[PDB]
Fold this protein.
Amino acid sequence: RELPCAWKPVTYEEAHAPHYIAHRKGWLSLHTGNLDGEDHAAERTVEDVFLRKFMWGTFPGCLADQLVLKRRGNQLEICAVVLRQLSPHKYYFLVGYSETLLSYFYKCPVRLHLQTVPSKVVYKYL
Amino acid sequence: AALVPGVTQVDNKSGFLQKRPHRQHPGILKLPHVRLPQALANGAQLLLLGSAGPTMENQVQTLTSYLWSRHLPVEPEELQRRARHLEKKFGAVLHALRKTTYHWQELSYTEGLSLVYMAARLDGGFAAVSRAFHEIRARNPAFQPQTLMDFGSGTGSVTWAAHSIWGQSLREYMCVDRSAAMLVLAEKLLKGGSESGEPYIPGVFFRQFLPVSPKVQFDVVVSAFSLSELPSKADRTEVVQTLWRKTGHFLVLVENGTKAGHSLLMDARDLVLKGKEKSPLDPRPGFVFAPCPHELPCPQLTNLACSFSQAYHPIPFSWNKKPKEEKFSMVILARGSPEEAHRWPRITQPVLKRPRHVHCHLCCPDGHMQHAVLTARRHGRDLYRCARVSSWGDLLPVLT
Amino acid sequence: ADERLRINSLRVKRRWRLSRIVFRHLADHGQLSGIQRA
RNA sequence: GGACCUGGCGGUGCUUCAUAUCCCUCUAGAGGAGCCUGUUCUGUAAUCGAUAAACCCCGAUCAACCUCACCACCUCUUGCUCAGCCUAUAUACCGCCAUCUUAACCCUGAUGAAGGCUACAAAGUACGUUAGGUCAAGGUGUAGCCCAUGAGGUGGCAAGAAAUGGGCUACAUUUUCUACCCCAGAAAAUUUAGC
Ligand SMILES: C[S@@+](CC[C@H](N)C(=O)[O-])C[C@H]1O[C@@H](n2cnc3c(N)ncnc32)[C@H](O)[C@@H]1O
Ligand code: SF4
Ligand SMILES: [Mg+2]
Ligand SMILES: [Mg+2]
């Protein structure tokens, strides 16, 4: 009335802060391009950006945690961790589709390594 | 819409265009960069010699930003409606009511806080009042006031400003302020910043309450940045009614150029225009001498504000190096009836000069705003040139 | 390229190709390879 | 009305100390000289203007007959391309800066309000806001003009005063020149920062 009367779960990657990237956390993407003397770092980063967007859009609400984008030679391993909510047939169809799409996208032998988990693996709570 | 392309023409009375260039057209009310009188400037620094160190750097900045961003006190009626909405959505409402609502406090100006105000607003306040007074002097040079009153005379800036313009006719300067510290501070300023001396301006009468006699009417009554200090709309209404009843020729009200300041002055404007006294001692009506070209409701009161800017040279201090600008809202109410029917639009926004065209935001006599893009071929060589030289706060001489 | 060069002869994190804000966002997540903040 | 309990005191003063920010302490400048300059005033019909866009020809540097802006005269148009515009709007939104507001248990008091500690131990343990700035290293829209806010021709536009702020140069005897890279010979008060 009168004026005077008036007067969250987190996974391992989410839980740990960025200053543990080389102490506790790791690197999701692993490529030689960024090393000293190696070239094409920006190209690899652009590929990583698109690849993460396309995985998260091709597996909506399925990925339990972030991908791991490994590259050896011309190979491109997406080691992803997903849930057990979708039917296995849909997972197989999406794996085939995304593998072929990315292999013709980058002209390189892309591959997927889906790892299903029952639910989000919470590390702690913030 | 006071600028119809090809129909509206420049208003040539006194043979303007023939006998004078365009840069001196009668609607030019721009005032050069305001410099305070040396006596006022010298006194302010002398009175501050006790403490002008790094501590005053923060206090002046803190006070200035606080006053600028201060909102009007929240009326209870607005509070209940806000309480109900939070109640429907939901002690908890009170906690949410602490936020989303402005905490308006009285500023109890003691000796310490009166020094901070003087170093923060004496220069700014003087320029704003000087611009408002120049409106009267420029358009009506025959006006020679003999008496003046200032409601809320904090540092005497109004008294100094009036002396600068009407010093050869004013004989009495009635000053009112409830804070005893300001009256002492102002009195020292008029005596060269010394407690013992001779007043620079003669006839000043310092008070703490308004005059009582019904039959005394001061020619010019002024209230600059004072109505925002009152706690409730009831006090604001009573003060303005008292001021208008004692206004002989002109009532000048000035506030900050914010939404809160503009809204306050509009309420005072409609209050005086819509006379309610059944049989006042003074039966003369009232009209808006400036800055409005009409008595109709404001067209920018909905969402925007209407403010004017006056650049001035600040008092030399440890933190006043470059020139500053004073953005303020004003309204002048004059007794009687408008002098003629040829009233001119008012430019209420900075004029943007661009190649071969000029952008002008105008308040028209019809009560509407017109964002007119003036060009030589559409509107004419004379009218385009007049707007090319015009500036914020001027009048555009257009007819029909 | 060749044509313009011939006449002439007679006479922000662009390193990674990222927006400067985005590079911080990526590097904090550990996404960039070997970009450890120190 | 008697006795007692909890208080709050948006408390007020002193006493003792922690007493760091900030002064004092240390170093180097700035007051001189010559230039260019920001601001302010006044002036003209006009603009004092701007060179990822002139001139240069040791270094620099002024107008250049440049050029876009401006003043005064004019001209082109269905034209560039269903044309063209360095127009407006963050007083449209985001982006970014800044303003201001804001648990249980166990004992004691005769089972009263209520209270519960001693270590050589005596009941205690478990977000909003703003006619805000910024569209120069960032974006999404919204409106303007379109025989003119588009395109061109002709000429003209040269500015002065102080008061203040900054920038560029040389400023030496613990110096300068040669040989060397260190044992040689010849010459001649205010106030801003930092640790
Ligand atoms: C800060 S001053 C106004 C600024 C001043 N006019 C200037 O030069 O800028 C406002 C004054 O109004 C005064 N005041 C507040 N309420 C008042 C009232 N009801 N009657 C008279 N004066 C009042 C206060 O004492 C305060 O000093
Ligand atoms: S917008 Fe027009 S009518 Fe409203 S306050 Fe300003 S001048 Fe007056
Ligand atoms: Mg704005
Ligand atoms: Mg010139």
